[PDB]
Design a protein around this motif. Structure first.
Motif, short mmCIF file in Angstrom:
data_model
loop_
_atom_site.label_atom_id
_atom_site.label_comp_id
_atom_site.label_asym_id
_atom_site.label_seq_id
_atom_site.Cartn_x
_atom_site.Cartn_y
_atom_site.Cartn_z
N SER A 46 -12.25 -6.17 1.54
CA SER A 46 -12.55 -5.85 0.11
C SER A 46 -13.28 -4.51 0.01
N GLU A 47 -13.81 -3.99 1.11
CA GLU A 47 -14.53 -2.69 1.14
C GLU A 47 -13.58 -1.55 1.48
N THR A 48 -12.36 -1.83 1.95
CA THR A 48 -11.44 -0.75 2.41
C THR A 48 -11.03 0.09 1.18
N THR A 49 -11.14 1.41 1.30
CA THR A 49 -10.60 2.36 0.28
C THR A 49 -9.25 1.84 -0.24
N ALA A 50 -9.12 1.64 -1.55
CA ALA A 50 -7.97 0.95 -2.16
C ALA A 50 -6.66 1.66 -1.81
N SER A 51 -6.63 3.00 -1.82
CA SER A 51 -5.42 3.81 -1.51
C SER A 51 -4.98 3.65 -0.04
N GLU A 52 -5.84 3.08 0.82
CA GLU A 52 -5.58 2.92 2.28
C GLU A 52 -5.12 1.50 2.59
N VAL A 53 -5.02 0.65 1.60
CA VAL A 53 -4.49 -0.73 1.75
C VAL A 53 -3.07 -0.75 1.17
N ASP A 54 -2.09 -1.20 1.94
CA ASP A 54 -0.68 -1.29 1.47
C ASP A 54 -0.06 -2.54 2.10
N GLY A 55 -0.42 -3.68 1.57
CA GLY A 55 0.23 -4.96 1.91
C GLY A 55 -0.54 -5.81 2.91
N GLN A 56 -1.61 -5.28 3.52
CA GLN A 56 -2.41 -6.08 4.48
C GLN A 56 -3.12 -7.19 3.72
N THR A 57 -3.46 -8.26 4.44
CA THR A 57 -4.38 -9.29 3.97
C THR A 57 -5.80 -8.80 4.26
N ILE A 58 -6.69 -8.97 3.28
CA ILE A 58 -8.07 -8.45 3.42
C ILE A 58 -9.04 -9.61 3.58
N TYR A 59 -10.09 -9.31 4.33
CA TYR A 59 -11.29 -10.18 4.42
C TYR A 59 -12.22 -9.80 3.26
N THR A 60 -12.67 -10.80 2.53
CA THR A 60 -13.64 -10.59 1.41
C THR A 60 -14.94 -11.31 1.80
N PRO A 61 -15.95 -10.61 2.37
CA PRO A 61 -17.15 -11.31 2.81
C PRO A 61 -17.90 -12.03 1.68
N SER A 62 -17.82 -11.51 0.46
CA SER A 62 -18.54 -12.13 -0.66
C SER A 62 -18.00 -13.53 -0.98
N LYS A 63 -16.79 -13.86 -0.52
CA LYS A 63 -16.19 -15.22 -0.72
C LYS A 63 -16.45 -16.15 0.47
#
Ligand SMILES: NC(=O)NC1CCCCC1
Length: 330
Positions: A46-63
């Motif tokens: 969830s911290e990764t620069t939005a323009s650098e994410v293209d289809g990966q599954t993300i870890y969201t530590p706040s959840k």
């Protein structure tokens, strides 16, 4: 304890392998590249620069109810292929194949280089080299294997990579049904932080075995087999029309060729890489020039027994007080 997880090639060339990893509470399952050539467990987040994410599954530590910011800790890594990533750090619960570590450092990417963004199938890396290479500052962190070791039935993990097929990573036990013959163990140097060993030599196809020491690393995170220029020249001289191309960046060969096998020595034992394992397909879509799976290490500074070599074997990463490597045919 033990764990056992299936590893799956990301594409039809076995360019890399992904293994599902549970992170956090409730679990967030990310597909990580298990890398015995590095020592950071890092994820798209969830911290990764939005323009650098293209289809990966993300870890969201706040959840995750078990995530804790590791205050002040940062990380930054640059790989042998020129790719890189950096960010901050959480501790969380991480499980692989039923084996759970609490308080694992989970490195959250703020930035990733283009090759990571462009690969939608890899959600991050799980490093399995020695913890002396971990990049976290100012307090270096332990790998998943180092944190699990004391709880494991045996302080080992095994890589059983498939050719154009799924395989297995096991932690804490050796599956005696997964290989043929006996496992030959060989000494490891941890002086560079890698699973570094010395092969006893090689053969090309049905040729005579050449006895010669080849120091290199067992690296599940590298696709190809990188060896001294003398050895690589000897192999590709057996393939009609093969040549080293400066424009393409290595040895290419006619896609019409049938490739010879390549054998490497482990002590008095021999591991045979079938010729088909050395074919990495057209250099560009529709080309009749194919990329070779055995390449020169001359420009690297180390020999690399990458996936082309390792997937021909059942490989034991023995993390006993004196580490060793084991190879068996399968
Ligand atoms: N696995 C690589 O491509 N490079 C490694 C060098 C040693 C530090 C960790 C990254």
């Amino acid at each position: 304890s033990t764990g056992s997880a299936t590893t799956t090639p990301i594409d039809s060339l076995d360019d890399a392998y992904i293994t599902p990893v549970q992170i956090g509470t409730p679990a967030q399952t990310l597909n990580l590249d298990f890398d015995t050539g590095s020592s950071d467990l890092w994820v798209f987040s969830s911290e990764t620069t939005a323009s650098e994410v293209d289809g990966q599954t993300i870890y969201t530590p706040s959840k995750s109810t078990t995530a804790k910011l590791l205050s002040g800790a940062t990380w930054s890594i640059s790989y042998g292929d020129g790719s890189s990533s950096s960010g901050d750090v959480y501790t969380d619960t991480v499980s692989v194949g039923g084996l759970t570590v609490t308080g694992q450092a989970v490195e959250s990417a703020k930035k990733v280089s283009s090759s990571f963004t462009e690969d939608s199938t890899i959600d991050g890396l799980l490093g399995l080299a020695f913890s002396t290479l971990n990049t976290v500052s100012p307090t270096q962190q332990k790998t998943f294997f180092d944190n699990a070791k004391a709880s494991l039935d045996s302080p080992v993990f095994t890589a059983d990579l498939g050719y154009h097929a799924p395989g297995t990573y096991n932690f804490g036990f050796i599956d005696t049904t997964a290989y043929t013959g006996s496992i030959t163990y060989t000494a490891v140097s941890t002086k560079q932080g890698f699973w570094e060993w010395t092969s006893t030599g090689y053969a090309v196809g049905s040729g005579t075995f050449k006895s010669t020491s080849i120091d290199g690393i067992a690296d599940t995170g590298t696709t190809l087999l990188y060896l001294p220029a003398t050895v690589v020249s000897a192999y590709w001289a057996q393939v009609s029309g093969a040549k080293s191309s400066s424009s393409v960046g290595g040895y290419v060969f006619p896609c019409s060729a049938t490739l010879p096998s390549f054998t490497f020595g482990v002590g008095s034992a021999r591991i045979v890489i079938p010729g088909d394992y050395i074919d990495f397909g057209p250099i560009s879509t529709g080309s009749s020039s194919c990329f070779g799976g055995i390449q020169s290490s001359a420009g690297i500074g180390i020999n690399i027994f990458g996936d082309v070599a390792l997937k021909a074997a059942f490989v034991v990463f023995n993390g006993a007080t004196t580490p060793t490597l084991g190879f068996a045919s399968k």
